[PDB]
Swiss-Prot record, chain A:
Family: Belongs to the class I-like SAM-binding methyltransferase superfamily. RNA methyltransferase RlmE family. SPB1 subfamily.
Originating organism: Saccharomyces cerevisiae (strain ATCC 204508 / S288c) (Baker's yeast)
Residue spans of biased composition, Basic and acidic residues class: 4-16
Described purpose of this protein according to its UniProt entry: Required for proper assembly of pre-ribosomal particles during the biogenesis of the 60S ribosomal subunit. Specifically methylates the guanosine in position 2922 of the 25S rRNA at the stage of 27S pre-rRNA maturation. Also methylates the uridine in position 2921 in the absence of methylation of this residue guided by snoRNA snR52 at the stage of 35S pre-rRNA maturation.
Descriptive protein name: 27S pre-rRNA (guanosine(2922)-2'-O)-methyltransferase
Location relative to the cell: Nucleus, Nucleolus
Residues of the full protein shown: 639 to 753 of 841
Swiss-Prot record, chain B:
Source organism superkingdom: Eukaryota
Protein family per UniProt: Belongs to the WD repeat BOP1/ERB1 family.
Protein name stated in the entry: Ribosome biogenesis protein ERB1
Subcellular location: Nucleus, Nucleolus; Nucleus, Nucleoplasm
Gene: ERB1
Quaternary structure and interacting proteins, as annotated: Component of the NOP7 complex, composed of ERB1, NOP7 and YTM1. The complex is held together by ERB1, which interacts with NOP7 via its N-terminal domain and with YTM1 via a high-affinity interaction between the seven-bladed beta-propeller domains of the 2 proteins. The NOP7 complex associates with the 66S pre-ribosome. Also interacts with NOG1.
Note: Present with 2680 molecules/cell in log phase SD medium.
Function description: Component of the NOP7 complex, which is required for maturation of the 25S and 5.8S ribosomal RNAs and formation of the 60S ribosome.
Curated annotation (Swiss-Prot), chain C:
Parent-protein residues present: 132 to 647 of 663
Recorded coiled-coil stretches: 203-248
Gene Ontology BP terms: cell division; DNA replication initiation; pre-replicative complex assembly involved in nuclear cell cycle DNA replication; ribosomal large subunit biogenesis; rRNA processing
Signal peptide annotation: none
Gene Ontology CC entries for this record: Noc2p-Noc3p complex; nuclear pre-replicative complex; nucleolus; nucleoplasm; nucleus
Name of the protein in question: Nucleolar complex-associated protein 3
The species this protein was found in: Saccharomyces cerevisiae (strain ATCC 204508 / S288c)
One term of GO molecular function: chromatin binding
Miscellaneous note of the record: Present with 11700 molecules/cell in log phase SD medium.
Keyword Coiled coil: yes
Subcellular location: Nucleus, Nucleolus
Length: 115, 50, 451
């Protein structure tokens, strides 16, 4: 029962690890295809916003910093593709909603013969 | 690099048993023939660094 | 007879709390260690106390009526209550019979709680305490197991919005990832019970109120109108989120069993993949079928006969379940298998090996992939060819008949009756085509006066 509590330390880790944004996705591409290596990103990591304590500070201050501490790095369409392919869940497009989509478009094709 | 095919689309080699050629010309074979179960698993619970 | 005095002391404490905050804390002080009779007679007596006294609104999120000391009383004492239950049911098979009986009665207490509790935020502890009891390689000495499976089944049949089911299957996934899928098939039947996933659809007598009271009533009605519409929108989004993540959990559970290849579990795996299929991403339908083709091709390198029959029946049931919207290797799967089916002696076997309970409404619920032995698998594969999922094929009608007649020579009696009953239905469809030689006199009086 130790692994029942030790594997969860990796399961919760890989939630703070997984990519959510387009801005993180581009940099993951820039690693994957050989454009930027580890050494290049460690240079880029030193921002306008580095060397900041975060654990001692009250939440009403950090919730105003974190909103406004986002450096607008350039994106790609190549990254936006994959991040839309990452978020799309299972029940996003079932048989039901496909049949319903055609049921919508048939009604539209009828409404343009009503005139 | 060890794969030696540039900014070309990987649309090519989708019908080949190899991904390109390398320096001193030999066939870089596609490494594994995975199961249909594992491929469906990786489209529900996607891999760690996907 | 000290037991009788203790019974009456606890009885007095029950009549105190049911009809007060120090008494419940005293009842938790009763069950600590070393005294088994106080550890069992009160623990099962606190169950109707908690059944009557638990407020279902998610208690503990931190005037005259305090309702804060009472709720710190209920919650803090409930921590050590369930924590005591944790220490009770963790005892392995190599223990004292008193301690083991304490474990059986503890899980009995827990499964009684779950039907009324699991509302407030001390549920995950009880869910671990029952799923860790179910997920064991050996069940032949626990009478509770069948009943706990039943309670989880009911839990997944009232759960409309999907919050309960997701909180169960996260813990359940943890257990199935630590232990390399050593499950008892009844647990995949409780996986089938999930109703989250599928859809299948006066003027005279008035108490007089003040003007300020009536205006308060109008405002309260308007607040409740907002609560109706907002909770409808929230739960409609919650159902979508829970479907999206439960289907991720359910399928990865299934396909990892399809890695390990346990001989008994595949039937229940394909129970799930056909029921909870057609609610996936609709790009996965081609992927599911290509998996079924793969699991056919694995058997083509040589128990496995069961697996290939399952693949055929499952595929046709999948496409016949596509109710809302608008197959070569599977018909050819049968056309190749029919020698191997009849060449085996294991055609008739009741199949009650490791499964304990027949899950829910087995009279109404038709287990459309693993109905009986294998005789009804041949029947339902052929029914799912020539009566469901078109594939008309008069050529294949003549071919399947000519292979069945080279299978009558290798059949038990009941199976040959059923096969000839299907050939009667093929004479209904395609007009071309104790004893031992029964009723073949009938069908061979449908060759000679017809052809």
């Amino acid at each position: 029962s130790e692994e029942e509590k030790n594997q969860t330390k990796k399961e919760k880790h890989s939630r703070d690890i997984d990519i959510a944004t387009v801005e993180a996705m581009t940099l993951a591409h820039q690693l994957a295809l050989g454009q930027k290596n580890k050494h290049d990103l460690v240079d880029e990591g030193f921002n306008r916003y580095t060397f900041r304590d975060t654990e001692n500070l009250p939440d009403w201050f950090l919730e105003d910093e974190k909103e406004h501490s986002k450096i607008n790095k350039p994106i790609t369409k190549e990254a936006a593709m994959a991040i839309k392919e990452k978020i799309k869940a299972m029940n996003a497009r079932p048989i039901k909603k496909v049949a319903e989509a055609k049921a919508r478009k048939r009604m539209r094709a009828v409404a343009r013969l009503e005139k | 690099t060890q794969n030696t095919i540039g900014n070309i689309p990987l649309s090519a080699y989708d019908e080949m048993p190899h991904i390109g050629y390398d320096i001193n010309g030999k066939r870089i074979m596609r490494p594994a023939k995975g199961s249909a179960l594992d491929q469906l698993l990786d489209s529900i619970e996607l891999p760690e660094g996907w | 007879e000290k037991i009788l005095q203790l019974k009456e002391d606890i009885a007095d404490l029950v009549t105190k709390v049911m009809e007060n905050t120090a008494a419940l804390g005293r009842l938790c002080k009763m069950v600590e260690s070393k005294n088994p009779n106080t550890c069992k007679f009160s623990m099962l007596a606190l169950v109707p106390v908690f059944k009557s006294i638990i407020p279902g609104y998610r208690i503990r999120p931190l005037e005259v009526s305090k309702l804060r000391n009472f709720e710190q009383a209920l919650v803090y004492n409930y921590k050590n209550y369930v924590g005591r239950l944790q220490s009770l049911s963790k005892t392995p098979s190599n223990a004292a019979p008193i301690q083991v009986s304490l474990g059986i009665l503890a899980t009995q207490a827990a499964k009684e709680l779950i039907s009324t509790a699991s509302h407030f935020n001390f549920r995950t502890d009880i869910f671990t305490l029952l799923l860790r009891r179910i997920c064991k390689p050996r069940i032949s000495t626990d009478p509770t197991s069948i009943q706990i499976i039943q309670t989880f089944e009911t839990l997944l049949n009232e759960d409309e919005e999907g919050s309960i089911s997701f909180e169960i299957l996260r813990i359940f996934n943890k257990i199935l990832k630590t232990r390399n899928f050593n499950i008892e098939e009844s647990v995949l039947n409780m996986l089938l019970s999930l109703d989250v996933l599928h859809d299948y659809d006066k003027k005279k007598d008035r108490v007089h109120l003040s003007k300020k009271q009536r205006k308060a009533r109008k405002e309260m009605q308007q607040i409740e109108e907002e609560m109706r519409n907002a909770e409808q929108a929230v739960s409609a989004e919650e159902r979508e989120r829970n479907q999206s993540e439960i289907l991720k959990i359910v399928f990865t559970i299934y396909l990892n069993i399809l890695k390990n290849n346990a001989k008994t579990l595949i039937g229940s795996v394909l129970e799930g993949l056909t029921k909870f299929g057609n609610m996936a991403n609709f790009d996965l339908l081609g992927d599911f079928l290509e998996v079924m083709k793969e699991l056919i091709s694995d058997t083509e390198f040589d128990a496995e006969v069961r697996k290939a029959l399952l693949c055929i029946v499952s595929a046709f049931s999948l496409i016949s379940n596509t109710q809302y919207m608008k197959l070569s290797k599977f018909v050819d799967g049968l056309y190749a298998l029919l020698p191997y089916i009849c060449l085996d002696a294991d055609i008739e076997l009741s199949y009650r090996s490791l499964r304990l309970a027949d899950p829910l409404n087995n009279e109404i619920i038709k287990p459309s992939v693993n109905v009986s032995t294998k005789a009804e698998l041949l029947l339902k594969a052929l029914d799912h060819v020539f009566f469901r999922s078109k594939s008309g094929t008069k050529e294949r009608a003549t071919a399947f008949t000519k292979r069945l007649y080279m299978c009558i020579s290798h059949t038990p009696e009941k199976t040959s009756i059923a096969i000839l009953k299907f050939i009667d239905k093929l004479m209904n469809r395609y007009p071309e085509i104790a004893a031992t030689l029964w009723d073949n006199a009938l069908l061979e009086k449908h060759y000679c006066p017809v052809v």
